[PDB]
C-alpha cells in the first residue's frame, strides 16, 4: 500500500495546465528550451495566451467541485510506524507520498487564431503632412517598432509577421501605420510602373533597386514611396525567398480586376470582352499578365452567358435559402465554381460543400434552384 | 482523538470556463 500524507498548507503556485498533443511534443522536446511563452498586454485586465514561435493558444480556467491533490513521493526522516488494525485489501506500506498541492480548477488550452493588437496604429493614406497629424492626436503614445507591436499582441511571432504583411502594415516617420486600400493600390501601381521602366526582374525584386527605380527622378520632399513603403508593397503582393521578392502576378491581376469590376460594372452589366479590355487597360504598360474572368470568381455574376456584373457578398442575405433564392433570381443558371465563394460563409455546421449546394440547389454541369 | 474522513459529494459540477489574466497565474 501507499501511505498518504498531507501538509497543513498547500502552495497555490502549482497549477494544472492542459497539454494538447502538440503542446506536449513541444514541452517534451530536449532539443530546445523556452519554446513556449505566456503573453499578455497587461497584468490585470487582458487575456493571457500561450505562444510558440508560430502558434497561439488561448487559456481558459475551469473550476470543479472535486478534491484534487497533487502528491509527491518523499523520504521520511523517521520510519512511518503505526499500529495495524483489521485492514483488509491493504498490503504493507512501501511508499510515502505527500499532497503538496490542492487544485480546484484546471487551465485548459485551446488552439486559437493569433491576432495583432492594432489599437494605437493609425491609417496612412499617403499624406505629406502625416507626421504632423499624428503628432496632433489625443493619444501621444505611438508604437515605434514592429517588435513592440508583436510583443504587445496576442499572437506568435510568425503569425504576427504574416498578418502584418497581409494587412499592408508599414512605418512612416518612425510611427507604425497601416496603408489605406487607396494608397496601397496606388503604391503598387507606381511600383509596377517603375519596375517596367527600369526592366527590373519581376521574379527577383529587392527593396533598394525598386525604391531607387521609383524615386530616381522625383524630389525627395514630394516622394512618399520610401523604402519601408516599397517593402510593405512587396510583402503584400510578392513572396520573399527564405532574400528577394517575386511578384504574385495572378493575385495582382485579380486585385486590378476587382477594382475594374467596382469601377465599370457596378449596378450595370457589360459584355465580357469589353470588360476584359477595360481591365487590361487599367494595368501599367507592358505589364506581363494574362487576365481571365475566372480570377474574379466571388466578385461577379453573369446575367447572360456573354455579360458580367459586379456583386458584393456584403449585400447578400445571411439566411441560406434567401441567398440562394436571390442569387438564382439574379442569374437563373450558374456554373458550379461560380457560386461557391458566394455561399461558403454560410456553411456553419460544416459538411460537404457540394451537399450544401444540393440542399438548396440541383445540378442539371450547371446549377439550378 | 484525531478525526479524518471524506464528506462525499453526491455528484460532480463543472463551473463555466473563465478568461485568464496575468495576475490569475501569478497570485
Amino acid at each position: 500500500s501507499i501511505n498518504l500524507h498531507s501538509a497543513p498548507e498547500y502552495d497555490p503556485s502549482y497549477k494544472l495546465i492542459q497539454l494538447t498533443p502538440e503542446l506536449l511534443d513541444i514541452i517534451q522536446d530536449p532539443v530546445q528550451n523556452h519554446q513556449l511563452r505566456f503573453k499578455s498586454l497587461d497584468k490585470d485586465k487582458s487575456e493571457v495566451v500561450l505562444c510558440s514561435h508560430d502558434k497561439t493558444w488561448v487559456l481558459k480556467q475551469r473550476k470543479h467541485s472535486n478534491t484534487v491533490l497533487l502528491m509527491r513521493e518523499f523520504v521520511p526522516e523517521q520510519p512511518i510506524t503505526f499500529d495495524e488494525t483489521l485492514l483488509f485489501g491493504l498490503s504493507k506500506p512501501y511508499m510515502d507520498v505527500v499532497g503538496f498541492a490542492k487544485t480546484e480548477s484546471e487551465f485548459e488550452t485551446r488552439e486559437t487564431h493569433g491576432e495583432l493588437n492594432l489599437n494605437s496604429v493609425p491609417i496612412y493614406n499617403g499624406e505629406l503632412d502625416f507626421s504632423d497629424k499624428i503628432m496632433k492626436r489625443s493619444s501621444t503614445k505611438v508604437i515605434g517598432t514592429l517588435e513592440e507591436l508583436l510583443e504587445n499582441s496576442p499572437c506568435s511571432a510568425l503569425e504576427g509577421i504574416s498578418k502584418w504583411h497581409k494587412i499592408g502594415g508599414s512605418v512612416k516617420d518612425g510611427v507604425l501605420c497601416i496603408l489605406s486600400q487607396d494608397f496601397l493600390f496606388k503604391a503598387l501601381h507606381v511600383l509596377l510602373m517603375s519596375a517596367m521602366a527600369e526592366s527590373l526582374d519581376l521574379q527577383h525584386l529587392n527593396v533598394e533597386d525598386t525604391h531607387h527605380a521609383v524615386g530616381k527622378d522625383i524630389e525627395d520632399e514630394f516622394n512618399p514611396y520610401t523604402r519601408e513603403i516599397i517593402e510593405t508593397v512587396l510583402n503584400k503582393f510578392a513572396v520573399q525567398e527564405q532574400n528577394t521578392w517575386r511578384l504574385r502576378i495572378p493575385f495582382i491581376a485579380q486585385w486590378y480586376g476587382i477594382q475594374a469590376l467596382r469601377k465599370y460594372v457596378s449596378g450595370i452589366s457589360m459584355p465580357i470582352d469589353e470588360f476584359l479590355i477595360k481591365w487590361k487597360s487599367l494595368f501599367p504598360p507592358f505589364f506581363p499578365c494574362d487576365i481571365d474572368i475566372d480570377m474574379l470568381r466571388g466578385y461577379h455574376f453573369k446575367p447572360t452567358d456573354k455579360t458580367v456584373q459586379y456583386i458584393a457578398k456584403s449585400t447578400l442575405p445571411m439566411d441560406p435559402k434567401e441567398r440562394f433564392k436571390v442569387l438564382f433570381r439574379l442569374q437563373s443558371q450558374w456554373d458550379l465554381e461560380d457560386i461557391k465563394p458566394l455561399i461558403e460563409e454560410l456553411n456553419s455546421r460544416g459538411m460537404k460543400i457540394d451537399s450544401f449546394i444540393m440542399k438548396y440547389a440541383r445540378r442539371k454541369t450547371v446549377v439550378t434552384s | 482523538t484525531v478525526k479524518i474522513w471524506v464528506k462525499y459529494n453526491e455528484g460532480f459540477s463543472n463551473a463555466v470556463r473563465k478568461n485568464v489574466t496575468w495576475n490569475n497565474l501569478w497570485e
Binding site: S1, L19, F38, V68, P76, L87 | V2, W5
Partner: protein, 128 residues
C-alpha cells in the same frame, strides 16, 4: 508582460532516473471534501506511536490521512480509521502539465506531466 516556460529541470530529471511518474508524483481525485483537522500542531502533540498520524518532514508537520492500494486499474482508498472508498486508475484523455508560477520573478517552471489519475467518485464504505 511576457515570460518563457522553463522545462530544463524537468527535462534533466526525465532523462535521468505504477502510475507514479519517474519524477515521483501522482494525482488523486475524490468526489467529495477531504476533512482534515484545522490545527495540526495541537493534535501532533497528542499523537501516540500507536496512531502514527503525524510526523515532521523538512520542517513541515504532515498528517497521515490514509492509505492507497493499487490493483491494476482498480484502486482502493482507506481514509481515517473508518472509511473505505473504491475507485479506479484512469488514463487522462488530456495530459496535465504541473507548473510552478514563481510570483517573485514572474517565472514559470515545468514541474511534471500527469498522464494518469487515481479517482474515487463513489460513496465511502465501512472498513469491511
Amino acid at each position: 508582460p511576457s515570460v518563457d516556460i522553463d522545462a530544463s529541470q524537468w527535462q534533466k530529471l526525465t532523462q535521468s532516473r505504477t502510475v507514479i511518474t519517474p519524477l515521483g508524483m501522482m494525482m488523486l481525485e475524490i468526489q467529495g471534501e477531504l476533512e482534515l483537522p484545522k490545527d495540526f500542531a495541537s493534535l501532533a502533540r497528542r499523537d501516540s506511536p500507536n496512531e502514527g498520524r503525524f510526523s515532521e518532514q523538512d520542517g513541515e508537520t504532515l498528517i497521515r490521512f490514509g492509505s492507497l492500494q493499487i490493483d491494476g486499474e482498480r484502486a482502493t482508498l482507506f481514509v481515517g480509521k473508518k472509511q473505505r472508498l473504491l475507485g479506479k486508475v484512469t488514463k487522462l484523455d488530456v495530459p496535465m502539465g504541473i507548473m510552478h508560477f514563481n510570483s517573485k520573478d514572474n517565472k514559470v517552471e515545468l514541474v511534471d506531466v500527469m498522464k494518469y489519475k487515481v479517482i474515487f467518485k463513489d460513496r465511502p464504505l465501512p472498513i469491511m
